[model samples]
Each structure stands twice: as structure tokens, then as C-alpha cells.
Target: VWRKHYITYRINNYTPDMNREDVDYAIRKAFQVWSNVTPLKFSKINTGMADILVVFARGAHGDDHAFDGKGGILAHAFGPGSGIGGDAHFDEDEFWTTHSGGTNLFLTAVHQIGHSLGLGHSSDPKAVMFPTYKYVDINTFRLSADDIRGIQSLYG
Candidate 1:
């Protein structure tokens, strides 16, 4: 897990498919969800080595895993560590959206950020950390008991 509770992050770049405001809003809400249940704090930074690096990239990005173009994998994130650790990469190939129609940024991000926070996949399908990506109404979203316990144990 991150050594410091106040974790800083930076959006490396914005994607072409979605509005910048939407992406930013989604990311903040994702972090806010976890912050609500844990001692962890999230702050955004620019032009520095943040604890977590949020990026929207395509095939053959710096990481070994390449976005297979649109459908195979949505995005991925590294657990706590140094350098590449805690970095999250969203596949630019997907039609990233903030609604129910397209892949919801906030929905996917909640799961990814869980991994980034040193949490693993939850067996409970209702949990945000579930291996499967299931979209729910973003505004009505709530973390499952398993999810809250998982992160609470990690950070509390």
C-alpha cells in the first residue's frame, strides 16, 4: 500500500473521445469514493512525479500490456510501489464515455483505482472491485461491503 495517506496523482494526458471535464470529474469521483471510506487522501498535481500516474493511451504504450484496440481490455492499473507503480492506463481505443451507453469512465475508474490502492478483485459481483465490469448508475453508485472492508483493511 502507499506509504503516505495523502496520495498525489496527475493526469498524464486527456483522451480524444471524451470531454476533458467529464474525464476529470470521473477520476475525482472515483478517488473520492475510496477516500470516503479510508484514511487515504487524494490530491491532483501537474508537472511533477505524482504517486499515481493516470493516463489514456493506446496500443504499445510504455507498459508491456497493449490495448488490443477497442474491446479486449478496457484499462489496467499497478498496485502500490515505486516508479510505474500505482500508474493507471485507460485504453484510448475504447469509446470512453460518462454515461450508460459507452464505457463509463467513473465506473471503470472505481475498479482501477481500487487496484491502484493495493486492493484486489472482489468475489462479490456487486463490489466495484469485481473482476467483471458492470455498469451502474454513476450518481447512485455505492461501494459494496466487501469493497469497503477490502480497502479499509488496506488503508485504515
Candidate 2:
């Protein structure tokens, strides 16, 4: 389990498909979603090692689980711990975006970060931790009751 209240993360790289500013914004927003509900705090770094390392890659970049190209396995994250733990990897094959027109970066990052924070996929489809991705209006997005319960159980 993650023993610290404050965590640090680094964006190892950016996807060529999106603007650097948008990618940075989406990542910050994703961490905010969790910090809003828990005692957890997140910080980002431009260099050096961090508790969480975010990257965008495609097809066996370097992990036990390799990407399956454009459609399957949009992304995945390691649970909290040392080494590769708490890292999140996004598939570069998909067009990541901030809008509903494409795979929304905010939503996917939120989901993957959930895993990075030691959260497993919720059985409820509405939960952000749900295994499958579904587009939702980011303006109106709120964590489901199940999501609150889970995070609270860990960090409340």
C-alpha cells in the first residue's frame, strides 16, 4: 500500500498527437480528481525520479504487458509500490484528446491514475475505476459513490 500522503510524478514523455500544454493540463487534472476526494497530494517534476512516471508508448515499449496496437489495451498502470510501481503508460496508437471527439486524455489518465493509487477496477460501470472506457461530459463529471467509498477506505 502507498504509505505516503504526498506523491510525486513525472511525465517521461509526451504524445506527438497532442499539444504539450494539453497533455500537461490533462495530467494535472487527472491527479486533481483524486486529490479532491482524498488526503493525497500530487506533485509533478520535469526531471529526476518520481514516485509515479507517466509515459506514452506503443507495442512492447518495455513492460511485462505489451500494447496491442490501435484498438485494444488503451493503457495500464502499476499499483502503488517501488520501482515500476505507480507508473502509467498510454498507448500512442490512439488519438488522445481533451474532448469527446477522441479518447479523452483526462478520463483515461484519471482511470489509470486510479490504478496507480492502488485502486482496482470497480464493478460498477459508472465508477471511474471501471475497466472499460466510456465518454462522459467532463464538465459534469463527478466520482461515483463507489469511487468515494474505495478511496476513503484507503485514505479517509
Candidate 3:
């Protein structure tokens, strides 16, 4: 179980495919998606250790899970805990984007953050926790009922 209600995150690196501001916006909005449905709070930090360290790297980045280039494994994250756990890493080889024509950073980050917060992929394909990534209308994005139930069960 998470020991606290408030959490901190740090963007350790940015993707060359998108502006830094765009990357920051995507990350913040992703956290807000879950925070809006639960009591959890997230803050961004520039230094020191954060509960979640967001990074972009290609291939093996010293983790047990090595990203498979651009398409296969877009990203991954660990459940809440110490060390590398709770960190979210995006495969730098992916064409990260704030909009269409590529992997949507906000959508992928939301899914990864769910894992960082102790959520596993839901069997419901509509759920954000679904293992596969799909583009949704970000302006109309809402957590599926299955997602709400899963998060609230842990964080409520």
C-alpha cells in the first residue's frame, strides 16, 4: 500500500520528438486524470529522488524490462515502492506526440502512471489500465468505471 496521499514526480529526460513544455503538459495532465478520481495528489520536482521518475530511453536502460524499439513496448512503469519501483520509462524510439499521427504521450503516461500507483491491466479493453495503448480524444478522456473502481479501491 502507498504510505502517503501526496506524491512527487520528476521528469528525468525529455523526448526529442516533442518540446519540453509539451512533454511537461502531457505528464501533468496524465497525473491529473487519476488524481481527479482519487485522493492522491502529485507534484513535480527538478531534483532529488521522487516517487516517480519519468524518463525516455531506448533499449535496456538498466531495468529488467528492456523496451523493444518503437512499436512493441511503448513504455512501462513499476508499482509503488522504493528504488526503481514507481518509475515510468518511455521508449525513446517511439514518436512521442501531444496529438495525432504518433504515440500519444498523455495517453501512454496515464496508463503507465496507473501501474506506478499499483494498478494492473484491466480485462476491460475500454479501461485505461488495459495493456495495449490506443488513441482517445484527450479532451473527452474519462476513466472507465473499471478504472475508477480499481484506483479507488487502493487510494480511496
TM-score of each: 0.97, 0.97, 0.97
Q: Per-residue lDDT tens digits of candidate 3, residues 1-156?
A: 578999999999889999999999999999999999999999999989999999999998998788888789999998899989899999999999998899999999999999999998899888999987889888888899999999999999
Please report the candidate that would top lDDT against the real structure: 3
Report the CA-based lDDT of candidate 3 relative to the real structure.
Answer: 0.93
Off by over 4 Å in 3: none
- Residue-pair clashes per candidate: 0, 0, 0
Task: Give all candidates' CA lDDT scores.
Answer: 0.91, 0.92, 0.93
lDDT of 2 by residue, 1-156 (tens): 589999999999999888999999999999999999999999998788899999999988878899988887899999999999999999999989878877999999999999999888799988999888999989899999999999889889
Q: In model 1, where do residues sit more than 4 Å from their true spots? A: none
lDDT tens digits by residue: candidate 1, 12-64: 99988788998999999999999999988999998879999999998989788
Candidate 2, residue 12: CA error in Å?
0.3
Model 2 steric clash pairs: none
Model 1 error, position 46 (Å): 1.5
